[model samples]
Target: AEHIVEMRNKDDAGNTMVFQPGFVKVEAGDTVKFVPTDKSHNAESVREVWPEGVAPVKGGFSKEVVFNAEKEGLYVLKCAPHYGMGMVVLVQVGKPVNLDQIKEYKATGLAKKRLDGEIAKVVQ
Candidate 1:
């Protein structure tokens, strides 16, 4: 399933910080779609500590881009021009397990098991 994040002004009517549903649970094979309900909106991914690859809509419409989260971690994406208006979003891929949690779950001897379990659930 895809998630919808609304882009709007902070003080405008019905303004909200919408984000992809279950974004933290996204897997490598899952795709997130950012739909704009207004004109002149675009989606972009932050790259190399800079904003690159800005996808602007044409005629107030645009196509969907599928992101394959091959690695398990957190990713930040945003909308150019509207980023200051709170158009940024965070996407977390794979299961909700972390290195710290792994140690707690395995108690040292089962570290391999913890790693294996997390990798097994990776979408790709």
Candidate 2:
């Protein structure tokens, strides 16, 4: 099966965030479609925090991109512009066993201030 992550979404913070279904869990081969619900939205993977070795995840609304989940871990993606407002998402492929590895990645910008709580939505 497949899933779609709407590019525009918000929490109590309002108008700030990515992926309506922010927390997604799927098999190794499952597909995740990044759908831009609003304007100027895209999907971008945080390479530093990504699994040890996996295909990169990057895309925008100019054209919908179908990302392939090929490993078992926590995949954190964010919106290019909305990231400051906490536009982010978590794709848990298989078991999210490496959540710690990704969690250690230093978030320099607003992500450091906002994403911590947002990521908690999935796991610790």
Candidate 3:
């Protein structure tokens, strides 16, 4: 959780919304905080990609979410305003308990495009 989910690590590409160190791994019973380095960003669990037993936390369009990695699984995070901008993140709790199940998930817009690339970084 040290490389927290950040919103705006600007680039020449210009803050298309992003997370730092993009992928994170933690153990069950651990806590991960989604911290936004820039304004207008918040983190929340993407229902479609959240594992079966993991309880989703509430953090959208604000600042941060203190997510308890209570269940062992893989999960997804996105920023509200820039969700379409592909501000997405992947979190691994313990093992990637739901990797196969989550791969089938699909997003609608830019998030989908962003995720298409990001997922590979962790999955591989």
Candidate 4:
């Protein structure tokens, strides 16, 4: 299936700083696109939340990002500027094979809180 994630500055309920449907699931070879629905938002791979040996991916601010899921594991992404506001997303390509490792990533403030919840969503 074709997966699309939108970067938004605010949610439907007036909640600021968030990604719509922060959790995404896709096949290993599936392609996902991150659309800059709002300005100043970009998709960037979290340094320590990627699959083993999989290189990180980062996008330019306010630009669209096309992500090809070539690895079979969890991919945690965050918005560079809004990270402190908890703009985080989790993409599961095939299976969350690296979930345990992802859970161990060091995060603080809203980012940590949001990351914990997103991780739990995968576990459930």
Candidate 5:
């Protein structure tokens, strides 16, 4: 599997060091790539709460990692020094993403609107 995620140096409030799309999903034996569109970012996993034996590296504009999704669970990924900046992501393996679970929003419409919003936020 091939997965890609982008990082934002800041958030909507201009918080330095943030991950634009903080969550990602992938299957077993999938390859996840971290593509930094704005500034330099690192893709690293924390111990225990994160995938075991995973480490974060700097200057990972084109860095890629093959995750062992066989474990089948939720894992957290984050940027080293910017962890408090909400530069974190949750990786769920083998779990279906139910956008409908998002209260007060129609799944399809919300998804479309969210996509558009994200594009506008990042592009502008």
Candidate 6:
């Protein structure tokens, strides 16, 4: 299936700087499309959370980027501009893998809190 996740500055409850539907589950080989619903936001995969040797998902501001999930693992994505403000996304492709590496790369403050929350949602 094709998943569409948006980069939004605010959420339904007026929460600022978020990725609408913060978490997603897709089968291996499915495609995910990150849409810039708000300005100044771009989706990029967090370097530490990706599966081994997978190319990073780098998006351009105000443009849509499509990512093909060919591996089975968890992908943590964040908005480059608003990441520190807690704009993060969690993509679970098939199984959750490389979990230790995720914990290895530490974040601070809001970024850390947000990513931890997203990680908690994973079934493992």
Better of 1 and 5 by TM-score: 5
Residue runs of model 3 more than 4 Å from their true location after superposition: 1-3, 9-15
Candidate 1 per-residue lDDT, tens place, 2-121, comes to: 555544334244543332321335766666666654445555664422212333222222434445555665455555565454555555565433433322332122323323333344
Worst 10 residues of 1 by lDDT: 50-59
* Candidate 2 deviant stretches above 4 angstroms: 9-13, 108-110
lDDT of 4: 0.85
TM-score (C-alpha) between model 1 and the true structure: 0.50
Q: What is the clash tally of candidate 6? A: 0
Clashing pairs in 5: 44-56
Report backbone clashes per prediction: 0, 1, 0, 0, 1, 0
For residues 10-47, what per-residue lDDT tens digits would candidate 3 score against the true structure?
A: 64456467876457877777778877677777888787
Of candidates 6 and 1, the better by TM-score: 6
Residues 1-124, model 4: lDDT tens digits: 7799999988897867888778888887788889999998999888766666787879999999877998788898989999999999888888778877888788898888877888888843
Expressed as tens digits, the lDDT of each residue in 28-55 for candidate 2 is: 8899998867668788887777777677
Model 1 whole-model lDDT (C-alpha atoms)? 0.44
Every model: Cα RMSD to truth:
11.9, 2.5, 2.4, 1.4, 9.4, 1.3
Better candidate number, 2 or 4, judged by lDDT: 4
* Per-residue lDDT of candidate 5, residues 54-109 (tens digit): 44333454354434455544555666655554466555655523222222222233
lDDT, candidate 5, residue 65?
A: 42
List candidate 6 stretches off by more than 4 Å.
none
